[PDB]
C-alpha cells in the first residue's frame with residue numbers, strides 16, 4: 264500500500280557507501296547481545312565457540328519518514344541497501360552468520376531515523392588459556408569487536424545498561440567449565456590505520472573438577488597403593504616384586520602419556536603432570552628400595568628386616584603428606 | 597600475478613615497521629627467534645614479477661620432549677642395568693627385567 | 701579371572717602375584733578405554749559405577765591374597781580359612797551386586 268511508497272522514498276537519493284553524518288560527527292552505535300550457548304572450550308586449540316544474537320542500533324537522519332506507522336519491520340531483503348556498520352570480532356578464528364532457511368537478519372527503522380539491525384552469529388573466539396594449575400584453573404576470556412575501517416573519529420560504540428543477557432546457562436555445552444559471570448569493557452586501541460574503539464565482553468569460566476578427578480587422579484593413586492602392596496609380599500620371591508614394580512611403572516607411563524595427551528603440548532609444568540610425576544617417583548622409589556633390600560639381604564639381613572617394616576610406614580605417610588600439601592596449596596592458590 | 601615488473605612495484609612501508617605484532621605472538625611449541633623482510637624479483641616463462649617475502653625463524657622448545665620421551669628411555673635403560681646386581685641363580689628375574697625393558 | 705587366583709595354592713606366590721597385578725592393570729586400562737567414548741562430562745554415569753565396583757573387587761581380591769601371604773608361615777590355619785571363605789564370599793557378592801545394578805537400572 265503506502266509502505267511501499269515510504270520504502271521507495273527512503274531509497275531515492277540514498278548512498279549506502281557513506282556513513283550517517285559522514286562529515287559532521289562520529290556515528291554512535293549501541294550494541295547488545297544475547298548469548299544462546301557458550302560451546303565447548305577446547306584447550307588444545309585455545310579457542311571456544313559462542314552463539315549470539317548481535318544487535319546494533321544507530322541513528323540515520325536519511326531513513327527518516329513521516330507517516331501514521333511508527334516503525335517499519337523488515338526482513339533481510341533491505342539490509343544490503345542502507346548503510347550497515349562493519350563490526351568485526353577481533354579475536355575470532357572463524358565466525359559465520361546463519362542462512363537457513365532465510366538469512367537470519369532483522370531490520371527495524373523507527374520514525375525518527377533510528378535503525379535497529381540484528382543478526383545471528385556463531386563465533387569461534389580465541390583465548391590463550393594459561394594452562395597452569397590444571398585442572399584447578401580458572402579462566403576469564405573475552406570476545407572483542409570493533410569497526411574495521413572506521414576509526415574512533417567516525418564510529419564510536421557504546422554498551423547499553425542491560426546489554427549482555429545470557430540465556431539459561433543449563434543447556435550449554437560447558438562440560439568441564441562452569442559459567443560464573445561476565446563483564447563488559449570499552450577501550451581504544453592503536454593500529455596502523457588509526458585509533459579504534461574496541462568493545463569487549465569477558466566471560467568467566469571456572470573448571471569443575473570431575474572428569475580429571477576420575478580419569479587420572481584415582482587411577483594413579485590406586486596404582487600407587489598397588490605399588491605399596493609389594494611391601495607385604497615376602498622378600499624372597501624376587502620375580503614377583505620385580506613384576507609388581509615394572510608393571511606399575513609401565514601403567515604409570517601410559518597413564519602419564521594419556522593425561523598429557525588430554526591437554527596440548529606445553530613446555531611448562533602444570534599441576535596434573537606434577538601429580539603423575541610424583542606418583543612415578545613414588546613407584547620408582549619403592550622399586551629401587553626393594554632392590555637395595557634384596558641386594559643387602561645377601562650383605563646384611565637385619566638391614567633388610569628393619570627396612571621392609573621401615574618402608575611400610577614411611578611410604579603411606581609421605582604420600583598422605585604429599586597429597587595434603589599439593590591439594591591444600593592449590594585450593595588456596 | 598597479472599602485472600610484470602614494468603607494471604607494478606612492491607615495497608614495504610617503513611622497511612622495518614611494515615610487519616608488526618610478531619613479538620606478541622606466543623606459540624605453544626615454538627618460539628619466534630626473528631623475522632626478515634626481503635624484496636626481490638622472480639622470473640617465469642611469462643615475465644619478471646616483483647616479490648616480497650616475510651620469513652620467520654621458529655625454534656622448537658625442548659622441555660616437553662625431555663619430560664615426555666627422553667626421560668623414559670633413560671629410566672628404562674637404568675632399569676635394565678639394575679639386572680647386573682641380581683645374582684646369576686635367579687633366571688626368572690633378570691630375564692624378566694631385560695625382556696620387559698626391551699618391550700618398553 | 702581375578703577371582704581364580706583364590707583356588708591356587710599358597711605356595712605359588714609368583715602366579716597369584718601375576719594374576720593380581722595383571723587384572724588390576726586390565727581394569728585400569730578398561731576404565732580408561734570406557735571413559736574415552738563419552739563426552740568429557742563432570743559426573744559419574746552408570747557404567748562408571750559398574751567399572752568402579754569391578755575395580756574395587758580386583759583390589760579386594762589382591763588384598764585378600766596379600767593378607768593370606770602375610771599370615772602364611774605364621775598362622776597357616778587362619779590363612780587357609782580366609783582363603784576358603786573368600787572362594788565363596790567373592791562370587792556371591794559379585795552376583796548380588798550384578799542383580800542389584802541390573803535390576804535398578806533396567807526397570808527405569
Ligand SMILES: *[C@@H]1O[C@H](CO)[C@@H](O[C@@H]2O[C@H](CO)[C@@H](O[C@@H]3O[C@H](CO[C@H]4O[C@H](CO[C@H]5O[C@H](CO)[C@@H](O)[C@H](O)[C@@H]5O[C@H]5O[C@H](CO)[C@@H](O)[C@H](O)[C@@H]5O)[C@@H](O)[C@H](O[C@H]5O[C@H](CO)[C@@H](O)[C@H](O)[C@@H]5O)[C@@H]4O)[C@@H](O)[C@H](O[C@H]4O[C@H](CO)[C@@H](O)[C@H](O)[C@@H]4O[C@H]4O[C@H](CO)[C@@H](O)[C@H](O)[C@@H]4O[C@H]4O[C@H](CO)[C@@H](O)[C@H](O)[C@@H]4O)[C@@H]3O)[C@H](O)[C@H]2NC(C)=O)[C@H](O)[C@H]1NC(C)=O
Pocket residue numbers: 339340341342343344358359360362364365366
Ligand atoms: C573466491 O571465490 C569464492 C567462491 O566463489 C568466493 O566466495 C563467494 O563469495 C560471494 C561473495 O562474497 C558469495 O556470494 C554472496 O553470498 C552471500 C551469502 O553467502 C552465504 O550463503 C551462501 C549461499 O548463498 C545462497 O544462500 C543465500 C542465503 O539464502 C542466498 O542469498 C544466495 O543467493 C544463495 O541462494 C542460492 O543458493 C541456495 C543454496 O545454497 C538456494 O537455496 C537459493 O534458492 C539460491 O538458489 C554460502 O555459500 C556462503 O558461505 C560462504 O561464505 C561464508 C561467508 O562467511 C563463508 O564463511 C563460508 O565458508 C562459505 O565460503 C554464505 O553462507 C549472499 O547474501 C550474497 O548475495 C547478496 O549480495 C550480493 C552482492 O551484494 C547481491 O547482489 C545479492 O542480490 C544479495 O543481496 C540481496 O540479498 C541480501 C540477502 O541478505 C539482501 O540483504 C540484499 O539487500 C539483496 O536483496 C536485494 O536483492 C535481492 C535479489 O538478489 C532481492 O530479492 C531483494 O528484494 C533485494 O532487492 C552473495 O550471493 C558466495 O556465496 C561465496 N561462495 C562460496 C562458495 O564461498 C570468494 O568471495 C572469492 N574470494 C575473493 C577474494 O574474491
Ligand SMILES: *[C@@H]1O[C@H](CO)[C@@H](O[C@@H]2O[C@H](CO)[C@@H](O[C@@H]3O[C@H](CO)[C@@H](O)[C@H](O)[C@@H]3O)[C@H](O)[C@H]2NC(C)=O)[C@H](O)[C@H]1NC(C)=O
Pocket residue numbers: 630631632634636649651652653
Ligand atoms: C630463511 O630462508 C630464506 C630463504 O633463503 C632467507 O632469505 C635469504 O636472506 C638473505 C639475507 O637476509 C638474502 O641474502 C641477501 O642477498 C641480497 C642479494 O642482493 C644481498 O644484497 C644481501 O646483502 C643479502 O646477502 C637472500 O637473498 C635471501 N634468499 C631469498 C631466496 O630470498 C632468510 O634469510 C632465512 N632466514 C630467515 C630468518 O628467514
Ligand SMILES: *[C@@H]1O[C@H](CO)[C@@H](O[C@@H]2O[C@H](CO)[C@@H](O)[C@H](O)[C@H]2NC(C)=O)[C@H](O)[C@H]1NC(C)=O
Pocket residue numbers: 422423424425426445446447
Ligand atoms: C555494561 O556496561 C554498562 C555501561 O558501560 C555498565 O553500566 C554502568 O554501571 C555502572 C556501575 O554499575 C554505573 O555507575 C553506570 O551508570 C552504568 N552505565 C550505564 C550506561 O548503564 C554495566 O555495569 C556493564 N556491565 C557489567 C560491568 O557487568
